[PDB]
Amino acid sequence: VANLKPRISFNFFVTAPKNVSDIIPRTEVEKAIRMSRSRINDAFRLNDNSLEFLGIQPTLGPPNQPP
Amino acid sequence: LYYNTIISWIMWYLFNSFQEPLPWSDCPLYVDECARSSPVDYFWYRETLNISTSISDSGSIQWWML
Ligand SMILES: *[C@@H]1O[C@H](CO)[C@@H](O[C@@H]2O[C@H](CO)[C@@H](O)[C@H](O)[C@H]2NC(C)=O)[C@H](O)[C@H]1NC(C)=O
Ligand SMILES: *[C@@H]1O[C@H](CO)[C@@H](O)[C@H](O)[C@H]1NC(C)=O
């Protein structure tokens, strides 16, 4: 984690467990966050709008009322 | 003749008033036209009127309007 601000902003990346030279590319981290975002948001009472991963856009909004 | 077309439009909006998220509340997944301006401006000119760009441009009787 880097660049912690009072805005509650910061940057993060991920590395392999016992290898500081291995950095998981962003694409895999984006896919992982997309998979577990419902759980990560619920762990912080956040709702995707409140918890924003810049570069990762929420795409799950199904609208339907009158069939 | 024209006051009964305006009442025609009023009762089209009264029939569409039975939906918790009223149909002029959100954008149709999002139409660039609707994305510009607002959903309300989109429900009137497209969803309700299917309006043209000129008086020289007439088309098909809007069945729901009829
Ligand atoms: C830790 O991760 C780094 C980065 O992936 C590894 O360094 C690469 O290792 C591969 C496999 O030996 C080589 O082909 C690359 O040329 C290395 N260079 C890079 C990408 O940094 C490193 O070997 C890993 N080692 C451990 C202890 O897990
Ligand atoms: C009216 O609606 C039809 C689709 O039902 C569309 O093809 C046509 O271009 C519309 N006309 C206008 C002028 O909006």
Short mmCIF file of C-alpha atoms and ligand atoms in Angstrom, two decimals:
data_model
loop_
_atom_site.label_atom_id
_atom_site.label_comp_id
_atom_site.label_asym_id
_atom_site.label_seq_id
_atom_site.Cartn_x
_atom_site.Cartn_y
_atom_site.Cartn_z
CA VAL A 1 0.00 0.00 0.00
CA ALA A 2 1.21 3.51 -0.89
CA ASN A 3 0.06 7.15 -0.94
CA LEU A 4 -2.47 7.07 1.95
CA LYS A 5 -4.47 10.38 1.96
CA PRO A 6 -7.20 11.76 4.30
CA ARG A 7 -9.50 11.46 1.19
CA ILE A 8 -9.18 7.74 2.04
CA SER A 9 -7.20 7.24 -1.21
CA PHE A 10 -4.08 5.03 -1.72
CA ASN A 11 -2.40 2.78 -4.36
CA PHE A 12 -1.81 -0.94 -3.92
CA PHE A 13 -0.21 -3.85 -5.69
CA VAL A 14 0.18 -7.55 -4.96
CA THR A 15 3.23 -9.83 -4.92
CA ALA A 16 3.73 -13.59 -4.77
CA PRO A 17 3.86 -14.94 -1.17
CA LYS A 18 7.62 -15.63 -0.71
CA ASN A 19 8.90 -13.61 -3.71
CA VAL A 20 9.10 -9.78 -3.69
CA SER A 21 10.28 -9.81 -7.36
CA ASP A 22 7.00 -11.44 -8.56
CA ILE A 23 4.29 -8.80 -9.09
CA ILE A 24 0.87 -9.98 -10.20
CA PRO A 25 -0.02 -7.94 -13.32
CA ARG A 26 -2.92 -5.48 -12.94
CA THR A 27 -5.17 -7.50 -15.29
CA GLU A 28 -5.23 -10.48 -12.88
CA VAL A 29 -5.83 -8.14 -9.89
CA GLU A 30 -8.70 -6.46 -11.80
CA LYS A 31 -10.23 -9.89 -12.53
CA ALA A 32 -9.86 -10.94 -8.85
CA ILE A 33 -11.47 -7.71 -7.60
CA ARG A 34 -14.31 -8.15 -10.15
CA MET A 35 -14.88 -11.70 -8.82
CA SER A 36 -14.86 -10.78 -5.09
CA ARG A 37 -16.10 -7.14 -5.15
CA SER A 38 -19.55 -7.98 -3.63
CA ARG A 39 -17.70 -9.50 -0.61
CA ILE A 40 -14.96 -6.80 -0.32
CA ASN A 41 -17.67 -4.03 -0.33
CA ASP A 42 -19.81 -5.91 2.26
CA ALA A 43 -16.72 -6.23 4.54
CA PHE A 44 -16.58 -2.36 4.67
CA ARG A 45 -20.35 -1.45 4.47
CA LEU A 46 -19.36 0.10 1.07
CA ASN A 47 -21.35 -0.05 -2.23
CA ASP A 48 -18.90 0.17 -5.23
CA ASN A 49 -19.70 3.94 -5.51
CA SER A 50 -18.20 4.52 -1.99
CA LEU A 51 -15.35 1.99 -2.62
CA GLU A 52 -13.80 2.83 -6.03
CA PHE A 53 -10.94 0.86 -7.66
CA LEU A 54 -9.92 3.47 -10.28
CA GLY A 55 -9.61 1.59 -13.64
CA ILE A 56 -12.17 -1.08 -12.59
CA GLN A 57 -15.74 -0.05 -13.65
CA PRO A 58 -18.81 -1.83 -12.13
CA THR A 59 -20.88 -3.46 -14.97
CA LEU A 60 -23.75 -5.27 -13.08
CA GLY A 61 -26.93 -3.10 -13.37
CA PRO A 62 -29.90 -5.18 -14.73
CA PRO A 63 -32.99 -2.90 -15.23
CA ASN A 64 -36.51 -4.42 -15.65
CA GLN A 65 -39.97 -3.57 -14.17
CA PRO A 66 -42.85 -4.21 -16.68
CA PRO A 67 -42.51 -7.58 -18.53
CA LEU B 1 -58.99 18.37 -32.66
CA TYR B 2 -55.55 19.14 -31.03
CA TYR B 3 -56.71 19.36 -27.35
CA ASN B 4 -57.85 15.71 -27.73
CA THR B 5 -54.32 14.71 -28.98
CA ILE B 6 -52.79 16.42 -25.90
CA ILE B 7 -55.26 14.44 -23.65
CA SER B 8 -54.16 11.35 -25.66
CA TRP B 9 -50.56 12.03 -24.55
CA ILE B 10 -51.61 12.76 -20.90
CA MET B 11 -53.35 9.39 -20.57
CA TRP B 12 -50.27 7.62 -22.16
CA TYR B 13 -48.25 9.08 -19.20
CA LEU B 14 -51.02 8.13 -16.70
CA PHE B 15 -50.92 4.43 -17.88
CA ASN B 16 -47.09 4.38 -17.50
CA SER B 17 -47.48 5.75 -13.86
CA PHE B 18 -47.75 2.20 -12.28
CA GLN B 19 -44.02 1.30 -12.01
CA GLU B 20 -42.00 2.01 -8.76
CA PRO B 21 -39.05 3.23 -10.95
CA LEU B 22 -41.27 5.36 -13.30
CA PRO B 23 -40.21 4.65 -16.95
CA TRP B 24 -38.78 8.25 -17.46
CA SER B 25 -36.46 7.71 -14.41
CA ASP B 26 -33.44 5.92 -16.07
CA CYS B 27 -31.56 5.64 -19.40
CA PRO B 28 -32.19 2.67 -21.80
CA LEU B 29 -28.91 0.56 -21.62
CA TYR B 30 -27.08 3.58 -22.31
CA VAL B 31 -28.52 5.01 -25.59
CA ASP B 32 -26.05 7.79 -26.64
CA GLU B 33 -29.06 10.05 -27.44
CA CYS B 34 -30.54 9.25 -23.98
CA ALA B 35 -27.04 9.50 -22.38
CA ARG B 36 -27.01 13.13 -23.66
CA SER B 37 -29.68 15.45 -22.10
CA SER B 38 -31.72 13.19 -19.68
CA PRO B 39 -33.95 10.04 -19.56
CA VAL B 40 -37.08 12.29 -19.29
CA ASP B 41 -36.09 14.16 -22.51
CA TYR B 42 -35.60 10.63 -23.97
CA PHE B 43 -38.95 9.14 -22.80
CA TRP B 44 -40.86 12.05 -24.48
CA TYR B 45 -39.05 12.47 -27.84
CA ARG B 46 -38.16 8.76 -28.42
CA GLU B 47 -40.11 6.35 -26.13
CA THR B 48 -43.37 8.42 -26.40
CA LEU B 49 -43.05 10.51 -29.61
CA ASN B 50 -40.50 8.70 -31.82
CA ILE B 51 -40.21 12.30 -33.14
CA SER B 52 -38.50 13.02 -36.54
CA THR B 53 -36.08 15.95 -37.26
CA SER B 54 -38.48 17.91 -39.61
CA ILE B 55 -42.18 18.47 -40.56
CA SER B 56 -41.15 17.21 -44.04
CA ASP B 57 -40.49 13.82 -42.29
CA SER B 58 -43.77 11.89 -41.63
CA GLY B 59 -43.67 8.11 -40.87
CA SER B 60 -45.85 5.31 -39.41
CA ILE B 61 -48.85 5.72 -37.02
CA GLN B 62 -47.36 5.01 -33.53
CA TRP B 63 -49.75 2.12 -32.58
CA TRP B 64 -49.59 2.87 -28.78
CA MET B 65 -50.22 6.60 -29.61
CA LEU B 66 -53.23 5.59 -31.83
C1 LIG C 1 10.36 -14.27 -8.35
O1 LIG C 1 9.68 -13.50 -9.33
C2 LIG C 1 10.55 -12.93 -10.34
C3 LIG C 1 9.68 -12.12 -11.26
O2 LIG C 1 8.76 -12.96 -11.96
C4 LIG C 1 11.31 -14.04 -11.06
O3 LIG C 1 12.22 -13.46 -11.98
C5 LIG C 1 12.01 -14.08 -13.26
O4 LIG C 1 12.09 -15.50 -13.16
C6 LIG C 1 11.85 -16.19 -14.40
C7 LIG C 1 11.93 -17.67 -14.10
O5 LIG C 1 13.21 -18.01 -13.57
C8 LIG C 1 12.86 -15.75 -15.46
O6 LIG C 1 12.54 -16.36 -16.70
C9 LIG C 1 12.80 -14.23 -15.62
O7 LIG C 1 13.77 -13.78 -16.55
C10 LIG C 1 13.03 -13.55 -14.27
N1 LIG C 1 12.98 -12.11 -14.43
C11 LIG C 1 12.00 -11.34 -13.94
C12 LIG C 1 10.71 -11.35 -14.70
O8 LIG C 1 12.16 -10.66 -12.93
C13 LIG C 1 12.07 -14.88 -10.05
O9 LIG C 1 12.75 -15.96 -10.68
C14 LIG C 1 11.12 -15.43 -8.99
N2 LIG C 1 11.87 -16.24 -8.05
C15 LIG C 1 11.35 -16.81 -6.96
C16 LIG C 1 12.31 -17.07 -5.84
O10 LIG C 1 10.16 -17.11 -6.88
C1 LIG C 2 -40.15 5.46 -35.37
O1 LIG C 2 -39.84 4.20 -34.80
C2 LIG C 2 -39.26 3.26 -35.72
C3 LIG C 2 -39.05 1.98 -34.96
O2 LIG C 2 -40.27 1.47 -34.44
C4 LIG C 2 -37.97 3.82 -36.31
O3 LIG C 2 -37.47 2.92 -37.29
C5 LIG C 2 -38.25 5.17 -36.95
O4 LIG C 2 -37.05 5.75 -37.45
C6 LIG C 2 -38.89 6.11 -35.94
N1 LIG C 2 -39.17 7.39 -36.57
C7 LIG C 2 -38.76 8.55 -36.05
C8 LIG C 2 -38.82 9.73 -36.96
O5 LIG C 2 -38.34 8.63 -34.90
#
